[PDB]
Amino acid sequence: GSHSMRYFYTAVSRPGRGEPRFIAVGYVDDTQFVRFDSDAASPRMEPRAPWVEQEGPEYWERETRNMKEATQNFRVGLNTLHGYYNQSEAGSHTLQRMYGCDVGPDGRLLRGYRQDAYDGADYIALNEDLRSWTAADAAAQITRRKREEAGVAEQCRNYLEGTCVEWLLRYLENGNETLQRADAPKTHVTHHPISDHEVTLRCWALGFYPEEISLSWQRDGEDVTQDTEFVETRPAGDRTFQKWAAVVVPSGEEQRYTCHVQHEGLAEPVTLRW
């Protein structure tokens, strides 16, 4: 239905331990497809999904050149902002960016973004209208000034409306057999007795994609969430995800409880019991 391509930049200074490290990862939906680490023996943009490997030499030349220029650029950013804030020469500082685009079921632009963050906090972002900036503070407004005076917004719009969407559509095609396909969760229930009076019922959802999922417990068909123990959804490492949900129940009342699971890959909701 609806798809997204996003890039994630991170620069981290390390005073008296070398120049700031720069790291990038590209994503389509919940699928990482490209990566870059400036601390690699030979810093290249590298493929992390089958359907980009096929890209020609000229592509990787371009991508790597952008990553190398990014690390230079962001290092300047770190230095400039350090001055605005007039900070001590002591510890580390970070500069992050997240940008990309969403396209609807119709394959047309839905909304574009290009956010920057200094030390884990919003610093400056491109408004959804793609011609203005939101500065989070005194410093960021100085940045805002320079970017408006240089016509940076227009350039961003050009990439976001055109280039960014084009690529996304291209990736959707070339890797359709996995990107366009949803994997249903593989559900089960485990039985972990605490004592002769209480036992834990944990409800597992495994090997699913994408990560958007819903788990819940019911008693006699009625909810009871403030009681349930979750874990955040975690990757299995194979491009699928895991998650469980437990409730502590009275030894003997296990029949009362059912686990309920909804996922994009299910034709219809599922109900498990112990």
């Binding site: 990014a70 650029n73 320079k146 970017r147 240089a150 940076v152 350039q155 280039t163």
Partner: peptide, 12 residues
């Protein structure tokens, strides 16, 4: 497709 740098010597 990553975004090309951005001209202007004025990014930060």
């Amino acid at each position: 497709g990553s975004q090309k740098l951005t001209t202007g010597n004025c990014n930060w």
